[PDB]
């Protein structure tokens, strides 16, 4: 034996911080706390995305509607909560640079991204055995790095400066675009079937106001 393990506390804390997605209401909107990271989410942008979807006549929004027709002119797109937008971004932060942790990490990301449950029921006892300060630290570091990358994006522009990132996996495609309001977040099927003009596939999307990630960037 090289080092005596004393891991109960460690595993208890990692389990708590990784497997509980904490949301509480605040005056502005909601505070979210996950993996020891704190985010203030507000309502800004939601009503705009909703109005934007309606097939009414509005020349002022013609360009935006025509820029993202798969979001704004599509009966199968659905606006989600800003909480959802944050969950997608956290998952993307895990997947972005994604050896034994991989499995577990993926699980956590899939939980964040494909469900709205606040507790993550571990699939197997072995994956649960994976929970550690090291896994938590890796996850936080990944998320911070991805937030920093996001903060380098330019708003949609006419000059060819990067304005979006895309994360692909076999189960889904994530696209995150910097707009004047914040991060436009979308999840489409892996083949990106929402992008097909003749029959636009289903797509979930929302907006995370730019106030939310700023303070967590380093």
Residue numbers in the entry: 9 to 106, 113 to 232
Task: Tell me what the authors wrote about this structure, in their words.
In order to provide 3D templates for understanding VP24 and its many roles in immune evasion, replication and assembly, we crystallized VP24 from Sudan virus (two versions crystallized: SUDV1–233 and SUDV11–233) and Reston virus (one version crystallized: RESTV11–237). We subsequently determined structures of SUDV1–233 and RESTV11–237 by molecular replacement, both at 2.0 Å resolution. One pairwise VP24-VP24 interaction is conserved in the crystal packing between the SUDV (P3121) and RESTV VP24 (P1211) structures, although it is currently unclear if it is biologically relevant. This interaction involves α1, β1–3 and the N-terminal region of α8, and buries residue L147 that was previously implicated for virulence, although 142–146 remain solvent exposed.
VP24, one of only eight proteins encoded by ebolaviruses, functions in virus replication and assembly, and is thought to contribute to immune suppression by binding to a certain class of molecules called karyopherins to prevent them from transporting a transcription factor termed STAT1. The overall shape of VP24 resembles a triangular pyramid of dimensions 73 Å×30 Å×30 Å.
